[PDB]
């Protein structure tokens, strides 16, 4: 019922995502059916494209200046994955307003 992401409203009161029923585990699978996938040893990277000053790290002098301008940048990347083995062990009946 978060009113931030759920922006469509139901006429009979509230957020149309509350009028949404989900059985996520139809039985016991003895094995996780939904899990967040992650990669080993190759997760988030971080770097700085800066010149003479770096507020992030607090560095005052740069031996290897990326550019002349007095600016600092910060880049991050991440790889994601998520698996659902069998959606047949998941029941969900949804309002049509949230469809197309």
């Amino acid at each position: 019922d978060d009113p931030v992401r759920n922006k469509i409203l139901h006429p009979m009161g509230g957020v149309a995502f509350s009028y949404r029923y989900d059985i996520w585990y139809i039985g016991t699978m003895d094995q996780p059916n939904i899990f967040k996938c992650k990669i080993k040893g190759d997760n988030e990277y971080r770097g700085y494209q800066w010149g003479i000053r770096n507020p992030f790290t607090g560095q005052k002098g740069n031996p290897y200046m990326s550019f002349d301008e007095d600016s600092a940048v910060i880049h991050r990347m991440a790889t994601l994955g998520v698996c659902v083995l069998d959606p047949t062990r998941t029941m969900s009946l949804i309002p049509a307003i949230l469809q197309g």
Partner: protein, 50 residues
């Protein structure tokens, strides 16, 4: 669904439970919103009314 019905739900959950679940395994927990809990209450009420 345009109009939520508990008739359709009990049919689907039973048929499913029959073909796939033991009588000791047919508990279904539904995760939903407060407005859905009210829709559920309203329909269970309309049901026992019958």
């Amino acid at each position: 669904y345009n109009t939520f019905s508990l008739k359709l739900l009990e049919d689907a959950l039973y048929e499913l439970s029959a073909s796939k679940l033991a009588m000791d395994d047919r508990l279904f927990v539904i995760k939903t919103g407060e407005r859905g809990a009210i829709q559920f209450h309203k329909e269970v009420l309309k049901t026992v009314s019958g």
